[PDB]
Amino acid sequence: ALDTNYCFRNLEENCCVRPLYIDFRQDLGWKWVHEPKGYYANFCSGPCPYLRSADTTHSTVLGLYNTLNPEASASPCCVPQDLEPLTILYYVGRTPKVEQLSNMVVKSCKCS
Amino acid sequence: ALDTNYCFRNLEENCCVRPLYIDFRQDLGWKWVHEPKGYYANFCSGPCPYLRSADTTHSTVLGLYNTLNPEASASPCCVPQDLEPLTILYYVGRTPKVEQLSNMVVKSCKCS
């Protein structure tokens, strides 16, 4: 699958999960977050040739169409499939808050 | 919403549904299909600036990240949201077959 295991162990040119570290304070301005300082949000990037992780029938038809008519720019795109939550600790004044944010980390991609 | 109604009536530069007609025989080689001869598969294309139809939290964080670090190329992508089936009539020999194919037409897009 186009998940972290496969993609991270292989130098894949086509649609795959790519590593991406985001620093809360530096990158987002989320100065209130205390822990962790950053995390691997990851992202999906890469061409979507015919049949590579086609999401739907439309994805399948377009992957073929884009191959024969690459000038139309009507290609399926590499986007997240499986995501995971992230638990963070931030303060509201001097009060600690532990919260789990949903769909923060990309674990796999697909061509849609 | 970034559906056909809004997108087709407005000249939208950012992520939106775009019209795309596909001819079965000419474009796909599906010579067996008798009716319809073609259809509007449509596709999603266009930039995904901060907050435009963000699919998830990750989509939201990345839309902001991409805005400040446009060189990293870690941007959410314009992809289908709502799709619709397509009923076709094709022949197997001299026998007619009426079949409904799922997720053939794009009705709306989102930024994922």
PDB file of C-alpha atoms in Angstrom:
ATOM      1  CA  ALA A   1       0.000   0.000   0.000  1.00  0.00           C
ATOM      2  CA  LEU A   2       1.081   3.644  -0.335  1.00  0.00           C
ATOM      3  CA  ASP A   3       1.565   3.887   3.411  1.00  0.00           C
ATOM      4  CA  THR A   4       4.531   5.023   5.506  1.00  0.00           C
ATOM      5  CA  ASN A   5       6.126   1.570   5.589  1.00  0.00           C
ATOM      6  CA  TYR A   6       6.378   1.138   1.817  1.00  0.00           C
ATOM      7  CA  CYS A   7       6.949   4.780   0.929  1.00  0.00           C
ATOM      8  CA  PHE A   8       9.549   5.528   3.588  1.00  0.00           C
ATOM      9  CA  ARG A   9      11.650   2.442   2.828  1.00  0.00           C
ATOM     10  CA  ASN A  10      11.500   3.018  -0.924  1.00  0.00           C
ATOM     11  CA  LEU A  11      12.537   5.950  -3.084  1.00  0.00           C
ATOM     12  CA  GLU A  12       9.152   6.276  -4.769  1.00  0.00           C
ATOM     13  CA  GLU A  13       8.687   8.862  -7.513  1.00  0.00           C
ATOM     14  CA  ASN A  14       4.930   8.363  -7.963  1.00  0.00           C
ATOM     15  CA  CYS A  15       2.164   9.136  -5.450  1.00  0.00           C
ATOM     16  CA  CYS A  16       3.357   8.273  -1.926  1.00  0.00           C
ATOM     17  CA  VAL A  17       3.492   9.564   1.665  1.00  0.00           C
ATOM     18  CA  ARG A  18       6.396  11.977   2.195  1.00  0.00           C
ATOM     19  CA  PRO A  19       7.873  12.979   5.570  1.00  0.00           C
ATOM     20  CA  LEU A  20       7.133  16.498   6.809  1.00  0.00           C
ATOM     21  CA  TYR A  21       7.950  17.859  10.237  1.00  0.00           C
ATOM     22  CA  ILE A  22       5.949  20.839  11.456  1.00  0.00           C
ATOM     23  CA  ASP A  23       7.077  22.982  14.385  1.00  0.00           C
ATOM     24  CA  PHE A  24       4.054  24.338  16.267  1.00  0.00           C
ATOM     25  CA  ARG A  25       5.507  27.657  17.411  1.00  0.00           C
ATOM     26  CA  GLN A  26       7.851  28.345  14.471  1.00  0.00           C
ATOM     27  CA  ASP A  27       5.656  27.077  11.629  1.00  0.00           C
ATOM     28  CA  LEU A  28       2.103  27.671  12.849  1.00  0.00           C
ATOM     29  CA  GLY A  29       2.466  30.280  15.555  1.00  0.00           C
ATOM     30  CA  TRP A  30       0.810  27.911  18.037  1.00  0.00           C
ATOM     31  CA  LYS A  31       2.891  29.355  20.875  1.00  0.00           C
ATOM     32  CA  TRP A  32       0.507  27.879  23.468  1.00  0.00           C
ATOM     33  CA  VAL A  33       1.433  24.272  22.688  1.00  0.00           C
ATOM     34  CA  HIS A  34       3.979  22.955  25.165  1.00  0.00           C
ATOM     35  CA  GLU A  35       4.342  19.319  24.120  1.00  0.00           C
ATOM     36  CA  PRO A  36       5.301  18.015  21.653  1.00  0.00           C
ATOM     37  CA  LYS A  37       7.271  20.884  20.060  1.00  0.00           C
ATOM     38  CA  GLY A  38       6.565  19.531  16.602  1.00  0.00           C
ATOM     39  CA  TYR A  39       5.322  16.466  14.778  1.00  0.00           C
ATOM     40  CA  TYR A  40       5.311  14.606  11.502  1.00  0.00           C
ATOM     41  CA  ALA A  41       2.224  15.814   9.656  1.00  0.00           C
ATOM     42  CA  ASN A  42       3.534  14.263   6.431  1.00  0.00           C
ATOM     43  CA  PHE A  43       1.979  14.907   3.048  1.00  0.00           C
ATOM     44  CA  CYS A  44       1.086  13.182  -0.206  1.00  0.00           C
ATOM     45  CA  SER A  45       2.821  14.055  -3.451  1.00  0.00           C
ATOM     46  CA  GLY A  46       3.670  12.419  -6.737  1.00  0.00           C
ATOM     47  CA  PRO A  47       2.154  11.535 -10.154  1.00  0.00           C
ATOM     48  CA  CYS A  48      -0.893   9.306 -10.398  1.00  0.00           C
ATOM     49  CA  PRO A  49      -0.337   7.027 -13.400  1.00  0.00           C
ATOM     50  CA  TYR A  50      -2.962   4.562 -14.634  1.00  0.00           C
ATOM     51  CA  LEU A  51      -4.136   2.172 -11.885  1.00  0.00           C
ATOM     52  CA  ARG A  52      -1.951   3.471  -9.047  1.00  0.00           C
ATOM     53  CA  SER A  53      -4.189   3.422  -5.930  1.00  0.00           C
ATOM     54  CA  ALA A  54      -7.288   4.513  -7.799  1.00  0.00           C
ATOM     55  CA  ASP A  55      -9.859   5.732  -5.309  1.00  0.00           C
ATOM     56  CA  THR A  56     -12.939   5.285  -7.512  1.00  0.00           C
ATOM     57  CA  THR A  57     -14.082   4.375 -11.025  1.00  0.00           C
ATOM     58  CA  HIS A  58     -13.718   8.058 -11.931  1.00  0.00           C
ATOM     59  CA  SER A  59     -10.112   7.895 -10.635  1.00  0.00           C
ATOM     60  CA  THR A  60      -9.528   4.864 -12.888  1.00  0.00           C
ATOM     61  CA  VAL A  61     -11.042   6.484 -15.999  1.00  0.00           C
ATOM     62  CA  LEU A  62      -9.179   9.748 -15.413  1.00  0.00           C
ATOM     63  CA  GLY A  63      -5.835   8.049 -14.783  1.00  0.00           C
ATOM     64  CA  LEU A  64      -6.166   6.533 -18.264  1.00  0.00           C
ATOM     65  CA  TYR A  65      -7.487   9.755 -19.824  1.00  0.00           C
ATOM     66  CA  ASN A  66      -4.609  11.804 -18.357  1.00  0.00           C
ATOM     67  CA  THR A  67      -2.120   9.285 -19.776  1.00  0.00           C
ATOM     68  CA  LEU A  68      -3.345   9.759 -23.361  1.00  0.00           C
ATOM     69  CA  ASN A  69      -4.203  13.474 -23.033  1.00  0.00           C
ATOM     70  CA  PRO A  70      -1.537  14.810 -20.630  1.00  0.00           C
ATOM     71  CA  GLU A  71      -2.162  18.355 -21.895  1.00  0.00           C
ATOM     72  CA  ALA A  72      -5.690  18.549 -20.512  1.00  0.00           C
ATOM     73  CA  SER A  73      -4.270  18.459 -16.978  1.00  0.00           C
ATOM     74  CA  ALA A  74      -7.190  16.312 -15.821  1.00  0.00           C
ATOM     75  CA  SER A  75      -5.237  13.940 -13.604  1.00  0.00           C
ATOM     76  CA  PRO A  76      -6.174  12.141 -10.370  1.00  0.00           C
ATOM     77  CA  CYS A  77      -4.298  13.647  -7.422  1.00  0.00           C
ATOM     78  CA  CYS A  78      -2.142  12.166  -4.643  1.00  0.00           C
ATOM     79  CA  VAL A  79      -4.113  12.773  -1.397  1.00  0.00           C
ATOM     80  CA  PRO A  80      -4.365  11.242   2.134  1.00  0.00           C
ATOM     81  CA  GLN A  81      -6.143   7.976   2.720  1.00  0.00           C
ATOM     82  CA  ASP A  82      -5.423   6.918   6.297  1.00  0.00           C
ATOM     83  CA  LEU A  83      -4.820   9.569   8.931  1.00  0.00           C
ATOM     84  CA  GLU A  84      -4.095   9.401  12.646  1.00  0.00           C
ATOM     85  CA  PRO A  85      -4.797  11.693  15.607  1.00  0.00           C
ATOM     86  CA  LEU A  86      -2.251  13.646  17.621  1.00  0.00           C
ATOM     87  CA  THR A  87      -2.334  14.260  21.363  1.00  0.00           C
ATOM     88  CA  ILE A  88      -0.953  17.617  22.513  1.00  0.00           C
ATOM     89  CA  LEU A  89      -0.462  19.460  25.771  1.00  0.00           C
ATOM     90  CA  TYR A  90      -1.041  23.202  25.793  1.00  0.00           C
ATOM     91  CA  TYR A  91      -1.807  25.785  28.455  1.00  0.00           C
ATOM     92  CA  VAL A  92      -4.720  28.128  28.956  1.00  0.00           C
ATOM     93  CA  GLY A  93      -3.171  30.560  31.402  1.00  0.00           C
ATOM     94  CA  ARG A  94      -1.326  28.325  33.855  1.00  0.00           C
ATOM     95  CA  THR A  95      -3.733  25.431  33.374  1.00  0.00           C
ATOM     96  CA  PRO A  96      -2.598  22.330  31.440  1.00  0.00           C
ATOM     97  CA  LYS A  97      -4.863  20.854  28.751  1.00  0.00           C
ATOM     98  CA  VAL A  98      -4.322  17.447  27.158  1.00  0.00           C
ATOM     99  CA  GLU A  99      -6.252  17.104  23.931  1.00  0.00           C
ATOM    100  CA  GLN A 100      -6.340  14.619  21.091  1.00  0.00           C
ATOM    101  CA  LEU A 101      -6.695  16.247  17.650  1.00  0.00           C
ATOM    102  CA  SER A 102      -8.178  14.131  14.871  1.00  0.00           C
ATOM    103  CA  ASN A 103      -6.710  13.486  11.424  1.00  0.00           C
ATOM    104  CA  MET A 104      -3.418  15.250  12.095  1.00  0.00           C
ATOM    105  CA  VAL A 105      -0.971  12.728  10.648  1.00  0.00           C
ATOM    106  CA  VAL A 106      -0.997  11.215   7.175  1.00  0.00           C
ATOM    107  CA  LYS A 107      -0.295   7.453   7.200  1.00  0.00           C
ATOM    108  CA  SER A 108      -1.185   6.602   3.577  1.00  0.00           C
ATOM    109  CA  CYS A 109      -2.063   8.211   0.248  1.00  0.00           C
ATOM    110  CA  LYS A 110      -4.266   7.313  -2.712  1.00  0.00           C
ATOM    111  CA  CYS A 111      -4.963   8.724  -6.169  1.00  0.00           C
ATOM    112  CA  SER A 112      -8.338  10.456  -6.359  1.00  0.00           C
TER     113      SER A 112
ATOM    114  CA  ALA B   1     -20.203  24.471  -1.894  1.00  0.00           C
ATOM    115  CA  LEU B   2     -17.641  23.600  -4.585  1.00  0.00           C
ATOM    116  CA  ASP B   3     -20.277  21.719  -6.544  1.00  0.00           C
ATOM    117  CA  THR B   4     -21.400  21.986 -10.168  1.00  0.00           C
ATOM    118  CA  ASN B   5     -23.967  24.700  -9.444  1.00  0.00           C
ATOM    119  CA  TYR B   6     -21.526  27.181  -7.909  1.00  0.00           C
ATOM    120  CA  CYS B   7     -18.500  26.278 -10.008  1.00  0.00           C
ATOM    121  CA  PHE B   8     -20.253  26.175 -13.371  1.00  0.00           C
ATOM    122  CA  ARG B   9     -22.016  29.518 -12.891  1.00  0.00           C
ATOM    123  CA  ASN B  10     -18.866  31.226 -11.631  1.00  0.00           C
ATOM    124  CA  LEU B  11     -15.441  31.692 -13.176  1.00  0.00           C
ATOM    125  CA  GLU B  12     -13.587  30.199 -10.219  1.00  0.00           C
ATOM    126  CA  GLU B  13      -9.788  30.151 -10.244  1.00  0.00           C
ATOM    127  CA  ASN B  14      -9.348  28.125  -7.039  1.00  0.00           C
ATOM    128  CA  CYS B  15     -10.341  24.491  -6.431  1.00  0.00           C
ATOM    129  CA  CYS B  16     -13.640  23.749  -8.205  1.00  0.00           C
ATOM    130  CA  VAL B  17     -15.419  21.208 -10.432  1.00  0.00           C
ATOM    131  CA  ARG B  18     -14.532  21.680 -14.110  1.00  0.00           C
ATOM    132  CA  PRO B  19     -16.505  20.301 -17.073  1.00  0.00           C
ATOM    133  CA  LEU B  20     -14.963  17.392 -18.978  1.00  0.00           C
ATOM    134  CA  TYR B  21     -16.656  15.365 -21.678  1.00  0.00           C
ATOM    135  CA  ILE B  22     -15.312  11.885 -22.353  1.00  0.00           C
ATOM    136  CA  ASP B  23     -16.151   9.962 -25.521  1.00  0.00           C
ATOM    137  CA  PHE B  24     -16.260   6.221 -24.802  1.00  0.00           C
ATOM    138  CA  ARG B  25     -15.043   4.935 -28.163  1.00  0.00           C
ATOM    139  CA  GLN B  26     -12.707   7.809 -29.109  1.00  0.00           C
ATOM    140  CA  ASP B  27     -11.218   8.541 -25.682  1.00  0.00           C
ATOM    141  CA  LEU B  28     -11.290   5.186 -23.891  1.00  0.00           C
ATOM    142  CA  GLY B  29     -11.563   2.646 -26.672  1.00  0.00           C
ATOM    143  CA  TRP B  30     -14.773   1.310 -25.113  1.00  0.00           C
ATOM    144  CA  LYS B  31     -16.129   0.418 -28.553  1.00  0.00           C
ATOM    145  CA  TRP B  32     -18.734  -1.903 -27.002  1.00  0.00           C
ATOM    146  CA  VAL B  33     -20.693   0.917 -25.365  1.00  0.00           C
ATOM    147  CA  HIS B  34     -23.692   1.889 -27.466  1.00  0.00           C
ATOM    148  CA  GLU B  35     -25.409   4.494 -25.296  1.00  0.00           C
ATOM    149  CA  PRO B  36     -24.593   7.150 -24.304  1.00  0.00           C
ATOM    150  CA  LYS B  37     -21.736   7.956 -26.719  1.00  0.00           C
ATOM    151  CA  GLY B  38     -20.029  10.071 -24.093  1.00  0.00           C
ATOM    152  CA  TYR B  39     -20.603  11.753 -20.760  1.00  0.00           C
ATOM    153  CA  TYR B  40     -19.451  14.481 -18.430  1.00  0.00           C
ATOM    154  CA  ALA B  41     -16.924  12.847 -16.120  1.00  0.00           C
ATOM    155  CA  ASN B  42     -15.759  16.282 -14.950  1.00  0.00           C
ATOM    156  CA  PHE B  43     -12.666  16.808 -12.845  1.00  0.00           C
ATOM    157  CA  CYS B  44     -11.336  18.866  -9.953  1.00  0.00           C
ATOM    158  CA  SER B  45      -8.581  21.411 -10.437  1.00  0.00           C
ATOM    159  CA  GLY B  46      -7.374  24.612  -8.859  1.00  0.00           C
ATOM    160  CA  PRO B  47      -5.287  25.932  -5.916  1.00  0.00           C
ATOM    161  CA  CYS B  48      -6.242  25.114  -2.348  1.00  0.00           C
ATOM    162  CA  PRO B  49      -5.640  28.275  -0.308  1.00  0.00           C
ATOM    163  CA  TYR B  50      -6.079  28.406   3.471  1.00  0.00           C
ATOM    164  CA  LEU B  51      -9.556  27.256   4.583  1.00  0.00           C
ATOM    165  CA  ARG B  52     -11.021  26.505   1.148  1.00  0.00           C
ATOM    166  CA  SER B  53     -13.069  23.291   1.591  1.00  0.00           C
ATOM    167  CA  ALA B  54     -10.602  21.719   3.984  1.00  0.00           C
ATOM    168  CA  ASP B  55     -11.301  18.011   4.210  1.00  0.00           C
ATOM    169  CA  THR B  56      -9.623  17.390   7.577  1.00  0.00           C
ATOM    170  CA  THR B  57      -7.526  19.026  10.299  1.00  0.00           C
ATOM    171  CA  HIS B  58      -4.436  17.973   8.335  1.00  0.00           C
ATOM    172  CA  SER B  59      -5.922  19.750   5.279  1.00  0.00           C
ATOM    173  CA  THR B  60      -6.375  22.880   7.424  1.00  0.00           C
ATOM    174  CA  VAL B  61      -2.832  22.805   8.849  1.00  0.00           C
ATOM    175  CA  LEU B  62      -1.292  22.132   5.437  1.00  0.00           C
ATOM    176  CA  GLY B  63      -3.290  24.856   3.689  1.00  0.00           C
ATOM    177  CA  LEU B  64      -1.720  27.315   6.141  1.00  0.00           C
ATOM    178  CA  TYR B  65       1.740  25.722   5.925  1.00  0.00           C
ATOM    179  CA  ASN B  66       1.700  25.833   2.101  1.00  0.00           C
ATOM    180  CA  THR B  67       0.754  29.526   2.239  1.00  0.00           C
ATOM    181  CA  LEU B  68       3.841  30.470   4.278  1.00  0.00           C
ATOM    182  CA  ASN B  69       6.195  27.894   2.707  1.00  0.00           C
ATOM    183  CA  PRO B  70       5.016  27.690  -0.931  1.00  0.00           C
ATOM    184  CA  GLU B  71       8.395  26.241  -1.953  1.00  0.00           C
ATOM    185  CA  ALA B  72       7.932  23.009  -0.021  1.00  0.00           C
ATOM    186  CA  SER B  73       5.116  22.037  -2.396  1.00  0.00           C
ATOM    187  CA  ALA B  74       3.175  20.483   0.483  1.00  0.00           C
ATOM    188  CA  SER B  75      -0.271  21.718  -0.494  1.00  0.00           C
ATOM    189  CA  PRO B  76      -3.734  20.168  -0.074  1.00  0.00           C
ATOM    190  CA  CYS B  77      -5.104  19.047  -3.442  1.00  0.00           C
ATOM    191  CA  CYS B  78      -8.387  19.670  -5.285  1.00  0.00           C
ATOM    192  CA  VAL B  79     -10.122  16.242  -5.453  1.00  0.00           C
ATOM    193  CA  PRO B  80     -13.704  14.854  -5.800  1.00  0.00           C
ATOM    194  CA  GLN B  81     -16.113  14.931  -2.909  1.00  0.00           C
ATOM    195  CA  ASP B  82     -19.526  13.940  -4.249  1.00  0.00           C
ATOM    196  CA  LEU B  83     -19.747  11.580  -7.201  1.00  0.00           C
ATOM    197  CA  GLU B  84     -22.665  10.078  -9.094  1.00  0.00           C
ATOM    198  CA  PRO B  85     -23.211   6.836 -11.019  1.00  0.00           C
ATOM    199  CA  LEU B  86     -23.677   6.467 -14.761  1.00  0.00           C
ATOM    200  CA  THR B  87     -25.994   4.025 -16.509  1.00  0.00           C
ATOM    201  CA  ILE B  88     -24.747   2.669 -19.841  1.00  0.00           C
ATOM    202  CA  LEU B  89     -25.953   0.282 -22.506  1.00  0.00           C
ATOM    203  CA  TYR B  90     -23.391  -1.950 -24.176  1.00  0.00           C
ATOM    204  CA  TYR B  91     -23.514  -5.210 -26.098  1.00  0.00           C
ATOM    205  CA  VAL B  92     -21.964  -8.591 -25.468  1.00  0.00           C
ATOM    206  CA  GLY B  93     -22.305 -10.104 -28.916  1.00  0.00           C
ATOM    207  CA  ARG B  94     -25.820  -9.140 -29.983  1.00  0.00           C
ATOM    208  CA  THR B  95     -27.124  -9.071 -26.420  1.00  0.00           C
ATOM    209  CA  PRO B  96     -27.924  -5.714 -24.765  1.00  0.00           C
ATOM    210  CA  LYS B  97     -26.677  -5.014 -21.230  1.00  0.00           C
ATOM    211  CA  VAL B  98     -27.862  -2.097 -19.103  1.00  0.00           C
ATOM    212  CA  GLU B  99     -25.500  -1.426 -16.233  1.00  0.00           C
ATOM    213  CA  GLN B 100     -25.078   1.313 -13.670  1.00  0.00           C
ATOM    214  CA  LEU B 101     -21.426   2.197 -12.968  1.00  0.00           C
ATOM    215  CA  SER B 102     -20.635   3.785  -9.614  1.00  0.00           C
ATOM    216  CA  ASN B 103     -18.719   7.006  -8.977  1.00  0.00           C
ATOM    217  CA  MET B 104     -18.418   7.978 -12.633  1.00  0.00           C
ATOM    218  CA  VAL B 105     -19.341  11.660 -12.452  1.00  0.00           C
ATOM    219  CA  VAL B 106     -17.812  14.318 -10.227  1.00  0.00           C
ATOM    220  CA  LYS B 107     -20.437  16.616  -8.655  1.00  0.00           C
ATOM    221  CA  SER B 108     -18.251  18.454  -6.108  1.00  0.00           C
ATOM    222  CA  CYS B 109     -14.630  18.932  -5.056  1.00  0.00           C
ATOM    223  CA  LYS B 110     -12.805  19.543  -1.783  1.00  0.00           C
ATOM    224  CA  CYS B 111      -9.245  20.310  -0.704  1.00  0.00           C
ATOM    225  CA  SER B 112      -7.543  17.305   0.876  1.00  0.00           C
TER     226      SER B 112
END
